[PDB]
Paper text:
[name] is an unusual AAA+ ATPase, because, unlike any other family member, it is localized to the endoplasmic reticulum (ER) and the contiguous perinuclear space (PNS), and because it is not self-activated, but instead needs the AAA+-like proteins Lamina-associated protein 1 (LAP1) or Luminal domain like LAP1 ([name]) to catalyze ATP hydrolysis. The structurally similar luminal domains of LAP1/[name] interact with [name], and they provide an arginine finger to the [name] active site to facilitate torsin’s ATP hydrolysis. Primary dystonia is a devastating neuromuscular disease that is predominantly caused by the deletion of glutamate 302 or 303 (ΔE) in [name]. We obtained high-resolution crystal structures of [name] as well as [name]ΔE, each in complex with [name], using a nanobody as crystallization chaperone.
We partially overcame these problems by stabilizing an ATP-trapped E171Q mutant of human [name] (residues 51–332) by co-expressing it with the luminal activation domain of human [name] (residues 233–470). A stable, heterotrimeric complex of TorsinAEQ-[name]-[name]-[name] was readily crystallized in the presence of ATP. We collected a 1.4 Å dataset and solved the structure by molecular replacement, using the [name]-homolog LAP1 and a [name] template as search models. TorsinAEQ adopts a typical AAA+ ATPase fold. An ATP molecule is bound in the manner characteristic of P-loop NTPases. [name] forms a composite nucleotide-binding site with [name] by providing arginine residue 449 (‘arginine finger’) at the base of helix α5. The small domain of [name], including helix α7 featuring glutamates 302 and 303, is intimately involved in [name] binding. Glutamate 302 and 303 are positioned at the very end of helix α7, and both are involved in [name] contacts. Specifically, Glu 303 forms a prominent charge interaction with Arg 276 of [name]. [name] has two cysteines (Cys280, and Cys 319, which is part of the sensor-II motif), positioned near the adenine base of the ATP molecule.
Residue numbers in the entry:
A (entry chain A): 55 to 331
B (entry chain C): 1 to 123
Write the structure that this text describes.
């Protein structure tokens, strides 16, 4: 049974450098789960830099709704690069995917489906799930209005970073970045007419995506926070000299200013093995 | 239902000649992610020759490129291998293979194999 306080605490204690995502997710998820008569399944699209917390947030959402999180019987993970790797097999993926979603929602109206690597998913396979996302009361005799769909993607990461870098160079705080700043920078790509058309409802004048959730590239200080957590998780005494040396081995961009981690947090943890026995 | 692959078409071919192998499956093959042909020559381990997805995308081992063509007929539950320009290097037992994979959960492959057909290419 989801609590707003518990979801907020889990986000605040564990998710670093994502002030926009924390707030959007907290209010979108709590408001939907707490609504006994939703009009449409909650559809979230989480976009942004590699290694900055998209699967991590998904686990936080899942574990706050169901015991076991991603291992709950009611939470379903599709990894497009693992499960849907070959474009020419689209029909075989589509047929299995439609059966799987329909059977599980039949059995559990409050099912959760996560589509990871959506930017590598055949557009025709995305088309196959659009009816489940819409404002229909019944789709082939089953209501999807209590279900939740979460998409994870890198598309838009570079543009989102343009905003973060502009704020950094201007002497502004990261937490001053607003959703409107991100939506404006994405007007030419993720938010252009063809994408808006692609994601449009087939029933009323609305988008199938309820919330765009942007993820910002991580700074050096966020990488240090994650290294400290990994040290504790391994049972090490934290050593700030190792924190700095590990973080210094990571590649940062732009070439001149060294502001953001190329890989977010990814690959950092294997470097601890060169500093600990 | 017991689904089985049966290969036919093997035999002796003179060097430079051609041969067509067929595999009939006793059940529907639409849902096989990949079907293909492997070969096992004396004292050697089995190796990929050619493969094809359900949507007809093909690939070939380096040693047969340009000479062999794989094709698939989902409606007739059959896969074929046309072999041209054969040399004694192609002598082997040929096996048809089918692979089925899940769309959720941990990776695995359910594999099916036929009993194989002997191809001998004389010098
Ligand atoms: N913002 C963050 N706060 C705290 N830990 C994080 C954050 N981002 C990543 N991590 C850590 O790094 C690990 C990998 O992150 P995650 O799997 O969420 O990356 P991702 O954003 O989905 O990347 P990709 O786009 O490459 O799939 C997490 O399990 C966690 O340990
Ligand atoms: Cl496949
Ligand atoms: Mg991820
Ligand atoms: Mg090809």
């Amino acid at each position: 049974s989801l609590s707003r306080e518990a979801l907020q605490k889990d986000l605040d204690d564990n998710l670093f450098g994502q002030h926009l995502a924390k707030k959007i997710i907290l209010n979108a998820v709590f408001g939907f789960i707490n609504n006994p008569k939703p009009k449409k399944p909650l559809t979230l699209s989480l976009h942004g830099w590699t290694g900055t917390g998209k699967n991590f947030v998904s686990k936080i959402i899942a574990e706050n709704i169901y015991e076991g999180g991603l291992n709950s019987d009611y939470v379903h993970l599709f990894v497009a690069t693992l499960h849907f790797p070959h474009a020419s097999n689209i029909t075989l993926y589509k047929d299995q995917l439609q059966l799987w979603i329909r059977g599980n929602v039949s059995a559990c109206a409050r099912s959760i489906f996560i589509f990871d690597q959506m930017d590598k998913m055949h557009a025709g396979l995305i088309d196959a799930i659009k009816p489940f996302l819409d404002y229909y009361d019944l789709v082939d005799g089953v209501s999807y209005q209590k279900a939740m769909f979460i998409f994870l993607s890198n598309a838009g990461a570079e543009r989102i970073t343009d905003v973060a870098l502009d704020f950094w160079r201007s002497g502004k705080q990261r937490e001053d970045i607003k959703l409107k700043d991100i939506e404006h920078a994405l007007s030419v790509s993720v938010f252009n007419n063809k994408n808006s058309g692609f994601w449009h409802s087939s029933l009323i004048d609305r988008n199938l995506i309820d919330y765009f959730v942007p993820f910002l590239p991580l700074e050096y200080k966020h990488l240090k926070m994650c290294i400290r957590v990994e040290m504790q998780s391994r049972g090490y005494e934290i050593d700030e000299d190792i924190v700095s040396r590990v973080a210094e081995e990571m590649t940062f961009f732009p070439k001149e200013e060294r502001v953001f981690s190329d890989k977010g947090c990814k690959t950092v943890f294997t470097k601890l093995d060169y500093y600990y026995d | 239902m017991q689904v089985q692959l049966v290969e036919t078409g093997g035999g002796l071919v003179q060097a430079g000649g051609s041969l067509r192998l067929s595999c009939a499956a006793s059940g529907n093959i639409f849902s096989f992610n990949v079907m293909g042909w492997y070969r096992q020559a004396p004292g050697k381990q089995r190796e990929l020759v050619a493969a094809i997805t359900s949507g007809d995308t093909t690939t070939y081992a380096d040693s047969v490129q340009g000479r062999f063509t794989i094709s698939r007929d989902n409606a007739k539950n059959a896969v074929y291998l046309q072999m041209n320009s054969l040399t004694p290097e192609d002598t082997a037992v040929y096996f048809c293979n089918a692979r089925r994979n899940p769309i959720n959960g941990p990776y695995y492959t359910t594999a099916y194999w036929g009993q194989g057909t002997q191809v001998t290419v004389s010098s």
